[PDB]
Design an enzyme around this catalytic site. Structure first.
Site, PDB file in Angstrom:
ATOM      1  N   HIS A  41       0.808  -1.227   0.000  1.00 18.44           N
ATOM      2  CA  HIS A  41       0.000   0.000   0.000  1.00 18.44           C
ATOM      3  C   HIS A  41       0.839   1.273   0.000  1.00 18.44           C
ATOM      4  O   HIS A  41       0.261   2.373  -0.045  1.00 18.44           O
ATOM      5  CB  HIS A  41      -1.040  -0.081   1.141  1.00 18.44           C
ATOM      6  CG  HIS A  41      -0.488   0.199   2.509  1.00 18.44           C
ATOM      7  ND1 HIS A  41      -0.193  -0.820   3.398  1.00 18.44           N
ATOM      8  CD2 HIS A  41      -0.373   1.356   3.207  1.00 18.44           C
ATOM      9  CE1 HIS A  41       0.182  -0.288   4.557  1.00 18.44           C
ATOM     10  NE2 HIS A  41       0.079   1.027   4.467  1.00 18.44           N
ATOM     11  N   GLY A 141       2.451   6.091   9.362  1.00 19.01           N
ATOM     12  CA  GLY A 141       3.861   6.155   9.063  1.00 19.01           C
ATOM     13  C   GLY A 141       4.633   4.927   9.512  1.00 19.01           C
ATOM     14  O   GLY A 141       5.763   4.725   9.041  1.00 19.01           O
ATOM     15  N   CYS A 143       3.915   1.746   9.024  1.00 21.01           N
ATOM     16  CA  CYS A 143       3.877   0.507   8.252  1.00 21.01           C
ATOM     17  C   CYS A 143       5.243   0.115   7.690  1.00 21.01           C
ATOM     18  O   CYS A 143       6.101   0.942   7.411  1.00 21.01           O
ATOM     19  CB  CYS A 143       2.840   0.587   7.131  1.00 21.01           C
ATOM     20  SG  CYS A 143       1.186   0.426   7.838  1.00 21.01           S
TER      21      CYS A 143
END
Ligand SMILES: *C(=O)[C@H](C[C@@H]1CCNC1=O)NC(=O)[C@H](CC(C)C)NC(=O)[C@@H](NC(=O)C(F)(F)F)C(C)(C)C
Ligand SMILES: *C(=O)[C@H](C[C@@H]1CCNC1=O)NC(=O)[C@H](CC(C)C)NC(=O)[C@@H](NC(=O)C(F)(F)F)C(C)(C)C
Lengths: 302, 302
Positions: A41, A141, A143
């Site tokens: 993502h 932030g 991930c």
């Protein structure tokens, strides 16, 4: 003496965490050899068969990748493996540790390296829950943060972070790209099965409580049941009461030997305490601790 | 979302931890510039005025100092500063970070880099207790392990481990050589005052719980008292009931303003739940968590 939930030292992992951004999406990646692993993502919030077309339209030159020393890395190829994006870099990470990609089982404890902008900002221990979630601490932030441990000089990578579910539950993939618990990297309602308390870890904690009491009182704890329950009979009850099954291990065998307390009294204690805890605390608490493992409790005996 | 007791990342500290041995006594040192700080009982188990004569009798060539990479360091001078032995090395540590030596106050929380043989084996968080102890996890060999955090790229060193008191209590010095809690590095009975629950950290944990309930249920918590108690009234009660005094702080003010909940409603909640908790849990528990700080809670909202 004393029992703590230990975190692995972080230097080997810090040397592999990088920043990965794409068109305003800021995440973290794991850089090993000439390969960066990061959640797909970073490309945007897509679903199903949209991902391969997104991948084909993406452009390597727009992956902004920086090391903690501020070197820019250059992506030369890209592919998807499950929900992980795999970006090849033009040069290899010369600080790649010995490592393995391992899937964490329910009850396994490991360390989260919580990263923002490619920099690990803190660590903490987590346990893989029965339903494929961990109870962690993450913000936008984070991930790409990873879960890991170190065993015999090898870094085991269990986890890469993708998703926060309701009630402060977190999940993600292994480093193969497979989601724990069968969740998906989509912002949609997702069923979360009931969490089962981890019996083997509770057993470790009760043994830690017995050691604490004995080492400084030479008298078994008042809360410890003297009656026993068999394993199969506890495991019957566990399935109906939200606990994982008890299963033997080397560490549990040793803890029972070292303390002299039959594990079947600990299982009966779980059953009684769960029904009505009463006023007697266990290591200060009136709820079960199930994120300290038998191996960790053993390693903290001198 | 989610709240954890965080550990600082350890790479900067791993680069400063060395092994220090003298005539069979094996502990750890902290190597900064051309100076190694380590517990003076590496020289043996002495008391009172004996240490100066012991220091004068010691010989630099018989200290065995090794870095994590196996490089032998050479001691060229020695001095005592409180209970800390300061050894000068012939060459400086080229990997010395920016650092400060700070003394931790009651409630201050920081990371233990638990070291054996000069190697950090694991990390975990601790809080400086009201009686000058920490509740840690140490075995023979761990002395010289350090407590630290990292703020604005500066390593704060708070603690160096020396001693285990009864009931699995740990204590040691700051990096200036001063023992916390007025303990001494002697294997004798020592006076250990009460460990009071840390109000400021309980307040932090209650704000964390408020934040979690707001995010999960769009309401205030069911357990949160509607009435306030004054700080002066609370602090008289705390002195009689085994709690530290409440004191305002920038982080607690920020949490009060973020949540809109007067801290005096939290203080009343502590008094009420301490006297009768009842069956409503707070963040899963029926006992106060007092090792999560206001600063850490604030940082975990962003
Ligand atoms: C990393 O990019 C973040 C980390 C999140 C942000 C808040 N805490 C975390 O752990 N992940 C996302 O923002 C993620 C992106 C998907 C496209 C994979 N979205 C979410 O985690 C959302 N969760 C969901 O929609 C849910 F799981 F279905 F509930 C939120 C609403 C942003 C948390
Ligand atoms: C480091 O050299 C060890 C760390 C200890 C070992 C067990 N767990 C720890 O944290 N420190 C010592 O062995 C220390 C040496 C003194 C000369 C400073 N001795 C002790 O910690 C002892 N404690 C005491 O005698 C007591 F505090 F008075 F209780 C024990 C009995 C070895 C734990």
């Amino acid at each position: 003496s004393g029992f703590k939930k230990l975190v692995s030292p972080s230097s080997a992992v810090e040397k592999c965490i990088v920043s990965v951004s794409y068109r305003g999406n800021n995440l973290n990646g794991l850089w090993l050899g000439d390969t960066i692993y990061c959640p797909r993502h970073v490309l945007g919030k897509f679903s199903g068969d949209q991902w391969n077309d997104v991948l084909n339209l993406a452009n390597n030159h727009e992956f902004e990748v920086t090391t903690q020393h501020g070197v820019t890395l250059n992506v030369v190829s890209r592919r998807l493996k499950g929900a992980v994006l795999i970006l090849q870099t033009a040069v290899a990470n010369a600080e790649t540790p010995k490592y393995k990609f391992i899937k964490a089982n329910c009850g396994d404890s490991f360390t989260i390296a919580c990263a923002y902008g490619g920099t690990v900002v803190g660590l903490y221990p987590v346990t893989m829950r029965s339903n494929g979630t961990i109870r962690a601490s993450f913000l936008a932030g984070a991930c790409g943060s990873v879960g890991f441990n170190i065993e015999k000089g090898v870094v085991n990578f269990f986890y890469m972070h993708h998703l926060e579910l309701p009630n402060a539950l977190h999940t993600g993939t292994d480093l193969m790209g497979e989601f724990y618990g069968g969740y998906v990297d989509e912002e949609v309602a997702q069923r979360v099965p009931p969490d089962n308390l981890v019996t083997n870890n509770i057993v470790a904690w009760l043994y830690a409580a017995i050691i604490s009491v004995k080492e400084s009182s030479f008298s078994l704890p008042k809360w410890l049941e003297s009656t026993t329950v068999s394993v199969d009979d506890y495991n019957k009850w566990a399935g109906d009461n939200g606990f994982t099954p008890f299963s033997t291990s080397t560490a549990i065998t040793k803890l029972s030997a070292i303390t002299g307390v039959d594990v079947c009294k600990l299982l009966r204690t779980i059953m009684v305490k769960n029904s009505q805890w009463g006023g007697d605390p266990i290591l200060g608490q009136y709820n079960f601790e199930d994120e300290l493992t038998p191996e960790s409790v053993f390693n903290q005996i001198g």
